[PDB]
A paper describes a structure:
SvS-A2 forms a homodimer in solution, which was confirmed by size exclusion chromatography, consistent with the dimer found in the asymmetric unit of the crystal unit cell. Each monomer harbors one active site which points away from the dimer interface, resulting in an overall antiparallel arrangement. One of the two modeled loops comprises a conserved RY-dimer of bacterial terpene cyclases in the C-terminal end of helix K (312PRYLSL318), which adopts a helical structure in the GGPP-docked model. In SdS, a catalytic effector motif consisting of a phosphate sensor, a linker-residue, and an effector residue was described to mediate an induced-fit conformational rearrangement upon substrate binding, positioning the backbone carbonyl of the effector residue in closer proximity to the substrate. A functionally equivalent motif (Arg182, Ser185, and Ala186, shown in light green in Figure 1) is present in SvS-A2. Since this motif exhibits a similar orientation in the unliganded crystal structure as in the substrate-docked model (local Cα root-mean-square deviation (rmsd) of 0.22 Å over five residues) as well as substrate-bound SdS (Cα rmsd 0.30 Å over five residues), an equivalent induced fit rearrangement would likely occur to a lesser extent in SvS-A2. While the active site lining is virtually conserved between SvS-A2 and SvS-WT, the majority of ancestral mutations are hydrophilic and dispersed on the surface of SvS-A2. The generated homology models differ in the conformation of the modeled capping loop K. In SvS-WT-Hom1 (as well as in SvS-A2) this sequence adopts a helical fold and points to the surface of the enzyme, appearing to prevent full closure of the active site cleft (top row). Studying enzyme kinetics with individual substrates revealed that SvS-A2 exhibits well-defined cooperativity for spiroviolene production with a Hill-coefficient of 2.1 ± 0.4, whereas it was previously shown that SvS-WT could not be saturated with GGPP.
Numbering used by the authors:
A (entry chain A): 9 to 233, 241 to 311, 329 to 359
B (entry chain B): 10 to 89, 98 to 233, 244 to 312, 329 to 359
């Protein structure tokens, strides 16, 4: 019993998606990233190029769309083999060092793989980003990437302990561990449109970005549907709901965040410069694209399941999203 | 044993005593410390003296205060955890730096950091705040990696050690506060130039290695364990590696400084004042300095491929 997804946002897909996907599938075979044929097939079947082509559906340079799509594949592969499943998945001490080595390899081209098959793959993606984006944009990606790995470390930490975070911590963690920071920070790299520091770091824009990430993360928890750390288990544990009531509750929260995204967007967009405007539409396309890609004649909710204009109850760390003085 | 090679400028803010007085006050009122003994230990760091060496001419005494507050905070945070819990703790503390609406939930360090962050947001631009934010996370990542190795009985090789220690010694957030103290906004096109990234890391690495010495998982253990050196052999070896890094910094700085804008220049002067100030603060907490480096090789450290890019001008 899943409600349709409320997502009155623009759905589009890059016209060169099949071409980029073909190049991606090839890179995957050359990359050394995958141990077996079965693993490669799994990685390919993510259709990560279909995915990221929905985030940057008018990217002028197919190579930029390719590079960024590769990291989406990389991310799914690294996630499935190192974060979500293998020995490190409940071994935070070992993961902290992996995260340190992997993150260092991203920042330091001279780093060596130390027998890790994921590292040369990542260093190649990074090499592509450094040839395309400005050092400022690469730093934004780099910082977003460490942010994601910090979320995963937090999550693997939780898993080791069997700790089910509360709502506030879960959203804070999941904001990072679902991969949205580094995903959305590639928008600029894909489109070529650099957002100036003064605009990019405006509290309002920081908030729209976090909100986009949060809706996408929560649509992913949906798509996933426990001991597993997800919105449904969090609400089941912390509020004693049945699965059905948690399903309904999660959809309200998520819809409420999306309405705030839409209201703040409408306030911010008119005065936005062109680079920021493009970034903002990327946030919209990504929210929609993430939902739709998870689904794939589709059906969508015409109305939000909840329309309260105030901060989400029990989630203080996101309440500043509704603070227009601060934004 | 051997005196430190550090031909860098030493200076200290003229209002250092005034700032230290206000800081001692804030530390007392911050709720950060459980006990008087703990407040005294935090105060005994002389972090205001330390950071007043990093930003000796800051125009606004309140910015030097705000930034000095965090140095006190970082020592206190570091002095007060298993890897699994630390990963969550790091996550939570970092979120409170980023989200003013985040609530302390009885964590003694979170309001204090949020007060520091509020002061930063009343002074610095949102951009300067983000820079500090990301440096803060990087430091936390390093502390998590170090905590991880300790928990496992994993003694990192020289490469992992330096990469980690670059993060864990606290130099990233420390140096990321120079702009907020001085008010000199560094434009991103300058701040993120790889050369400036490398100068920052080098300043950081040297300050970190001098901290290893001031402590008499550190460079000497790492070398003793992986190379089978005696302590005395490792000390000489460590001194050589470090001096060699500082030579690289001095060299790269002299290449970068002349073209630098006023804000970036002030920032680089901060790196230099920081390296010296760190060394000098560590000694004092009349001095003899080595006039010459113990090793003058201009080549990358063999056995440390993660920092080799510091010596690659092509990449810079």
């Amino acid at each position: 019993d899943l409600p349709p997804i409320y997502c009155p946002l623009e759905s589009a897909i890059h016209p060169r998606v099949h071409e980029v996907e073909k190049r991606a599938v090839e890179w995957i075979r050359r990359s050394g990233m995958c141990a077996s044929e079965e693993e490669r097939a799994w990685v390919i079947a993510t259709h990560s190029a279909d995915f990221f082509a929905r985030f940057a559906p008018t990217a002028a340079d197919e190579d930029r769309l390719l590079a960024t799509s590769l990291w989406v594949y990389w991310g799914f592969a690294f996630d499935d083999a190192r974060c979500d499943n293998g020995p490190l998945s409940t071994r935070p001490a070992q993961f902290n060092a992996l995260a340190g080595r992997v993150q260092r390899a991203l920042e330091a081209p001279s780093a060596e793989d130390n027998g890790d098959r994921f590292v040369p793959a990542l260093q190649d993606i990074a090499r592509r980003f450094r040839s395309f984006g400005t050092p400022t944009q690469v730093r934004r990606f780099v910082h977003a990437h460490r942010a994601w790995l910090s979320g995963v470390a937090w999550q693997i930490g939780n898993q080791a302990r069997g700790h089910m975070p509360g709502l506030d911590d879960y959203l804070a963690m999941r904001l990072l561990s679902a991969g949205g920071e580094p995903t959305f920070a590639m928008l600029e790299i894909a489109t070529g449109a650099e957002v100036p520091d003064r605009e990019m770091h405006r509290p309002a824009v920081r908030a729209l970005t976090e909100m986009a990430i949060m809706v996408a993360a929560l649509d992913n928890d949906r798509h996933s549907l426990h001991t597993d750390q997800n919105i449904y288990s969090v609400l089941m544990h912390h509020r004693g709901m049945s699965l059905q009531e948690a399903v309904e509750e999660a959809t309200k929260l998520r819809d409420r965040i999306l309405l705030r995204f839409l209201e703040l967007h409408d306030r911010v967009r008119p005065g936005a410069g062109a680079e920021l405007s493009t970034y903002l539409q990327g946030l919209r396309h990504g929210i929609r694209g993430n939902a739709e890609w998870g689904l794939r004649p589709l059906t969508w909710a015409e109305s939000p399941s909840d329309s309260s204009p105030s901060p989400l109850p029990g989630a203080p760390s996101i309440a500043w999203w509704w603070d227009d003085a601060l934004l």
